[PDB]
Design a protein around this ligand. Structure first.
Ligand code: AKG
Ligand code: CO
Length: 350
């Protein structure tokens, strides 16, 4: 009937080889470009830089840093998070080893069912919904890590042969970090330390996303990953070798997210914004490319169980305090998120 072979994009790592212009499907309209047309993409983030010593989170001055960071930016760097540098280095080395393999080897894990049907899990790109869609300058391998009995290990790279063990160990380590952050948030919001852990639920999704950003000859014309907020409750992000690129939006201004060696980045998701009545909000963020080197990151997305109603916590609505978000089942929120200027969560504000 009709040819829709534009739904099947070639990996950017291939398209980026040796080019001096970005192919047209990556080029943003002038007013949408990182510097809107200029070479100045972002402002340096002002002090105090949002940094949280996770081992000292029970101390009041550290809790005050976490609260200040979440109010101001919706994210923070974490130090002393309990994840050994050797394991952070190895999981990102395993990722680099996978992306460096031949296209043939990587497409054995393709997220294009039968070579044509997008699904989220596997190696490739995000869904192409229309011919005129501007694509991001990245590829990604995305894997469902939790619940354990829902994993499809056929999409997990078999080479290098320690990829699976490294990801499993790392994910179990980021779950500890997740819970420590969530307990500190329940405490500062006076909701109980286990409030958000229980809202999220024992079988909640945890998804690993290994991002690969090839060098781009014209970083002013494309996004490595387009402006967005994460949809779940909390994201724990690891950037290999702290290569720059990540930026965060605040009051319409884009700020470079600074790096610290051996740290992780925690950012809130939209589901958390609703659950906490907007006290802390989900930050809009993006990745700009560079001309010199590839950039690798690993995001651990912690979602909320699908049938949980997302709604402002009851403890935040005492004393006739008004709800600022309509309620919505978590699976319904994700569905609305994947629909096509205005972010979906704006439709829920009251
Ligand atoms: O690569 C990064 O630093 C950001 C990744 C990100 O925003 C995402 O995968 O949702
Ligand atoms: Co993100």
């Amino acid at each position: 009937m009709a040819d829709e072979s534009w739904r099947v994009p070639t990996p950017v790592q291939e398209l980026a080889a040796g080019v001096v212009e970005p192919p047209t499907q990556f080029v943003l309209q002038e007013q949408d470009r990182p510097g809107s047309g200029t070479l100045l993409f972002a402002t340096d983030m002002p002090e105090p830089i949002p940094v949280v010593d996770l081992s000292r989170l029970a101390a009041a001055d550290e809790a005050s840093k976490l609260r200040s960071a979440l109010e101001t930016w919706g994210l923070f760097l974490v130090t002393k998070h309990g994840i050994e540098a050797s394991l952070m280095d190895d999981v990102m080395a395993a990722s680099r080893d996978f992306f460096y393999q031949p296209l043939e080897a990587k497409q054995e894990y393709s997220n294009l069912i039968g070579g044509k049907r997008f699904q989220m899990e596997g190696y490739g790109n995000d869904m192409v919904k229309s011919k005129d869609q501007i694509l991001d300058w990245q590829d990604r391998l995305q894997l469902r890590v939790e619940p354990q009995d829902e994993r499809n290990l056929a999409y997990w790279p078999k080479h290098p042969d320690s990829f699976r063990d490294l990801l499993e160990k790392y994910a179990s380590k980021t779950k500890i970090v997740r819970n420590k952050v969530l307990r500190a948030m329940g405490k500062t919001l006076e909701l109980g330390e286990d409030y958000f852990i229980s809202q999220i639920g024992d079988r909640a999704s945890a998804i690993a996303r290994f991002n690969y950003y090839p060098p781009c000859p014209r970083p002013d014309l494309v996004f490595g990953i387009k402006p967005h907020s994460d949809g779940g409750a909390v994201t724990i992000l690891l950037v290999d070798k702290d290569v720059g690129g990540l930026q965060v939006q605040k009051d319409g201004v884009w700020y470079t997210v600074p790096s610290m060696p051996h740290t992780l980045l925690v950012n809130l998701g939209d589901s958390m914004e609703i659950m906490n009545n907007g006290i802390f909000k989900s930050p809009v963020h993006r990745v700009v490319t560079n001309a010199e080197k590839e950039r690798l990151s690993l995001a651990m997305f912690y979602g909320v169980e699908g049938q949980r109603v997302l709604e402002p916590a009851l403890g935040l609505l005492g004393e006739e305090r008004p709800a600022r978000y309509r309620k919505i089942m978590a699976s319904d929120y994700i569905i609305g998120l994947r629909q096509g200027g205005q972010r979906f969560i704006e439709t829920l504000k009251i």
